[PDB]
Amino acid sequence: TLIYKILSRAEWDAAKAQGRFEGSAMDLADGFIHLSAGEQAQETAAKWFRGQANLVLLAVEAEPMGEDLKWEASRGGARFPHLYRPLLVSEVTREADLDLDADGVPQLGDHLAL
């Protein structure tokens, strides 16, 4: 099961300079890194990242993550993957630079189809 994280290019480069991503401002505030399962990802992008250019999508295999990866019932009653530890750069299976629609919404369609 692949889970996803959307973040700014600046934050992703900063993470690679550290060897791991500790979280966005919101993640840090909440105490965990907000990730989305494939079927929840596009809505997450439409809700929190509108109009943001240079975003990057990180795809992560959930199975080997361990105890710090907790699935918690959240938006619409769906269980969202929450990581209670930094995301290692090595745990990213693949990344991709995102483009926006005419409404400023990042397009995840093609990447989720992989």
Q: Where would I find the beta strands (DSSP E) of the chain?
A: 2-8, 20-21, 33-34, 36-37, 55-61, 69-73, 79-83, 87-88, 92-97
Helices (H), the chain: 9-16, 25-30, 38-48, 109-112
111: its two tokens: 């990447």
Residue type, 28: L
Domain-wise residue ranges, the chain? 1-114
30: its two tokens: 């909440």
Q: Which of 97, 88, 93, 92 is nearest to 21 (CA)?
A: 88
Method of structure determination: X-ray
Q: Strand 36-37: give its sheet, edge to edge.
A: 36-37, 2-8, 55-61, 92-97
Q: Regarding the domain delimited by 1-114, which CATH topology (the fold level of the hierarchy) does it fall under?
A: ADP-ribosylation fold (3.20.170)
Q: What is the resolution of this structure in A?
A: 1.9
| Calpha distance 68→66 (Å, rounded) | 6
Q: How far is CA 73 from CA 42, 52, 69, 76, 78, in A?
A: 18, 27, 13, 8, 5
| Calpha distance 62→53 (Å, rounded) | 27
17: its two tokens: 């300079």
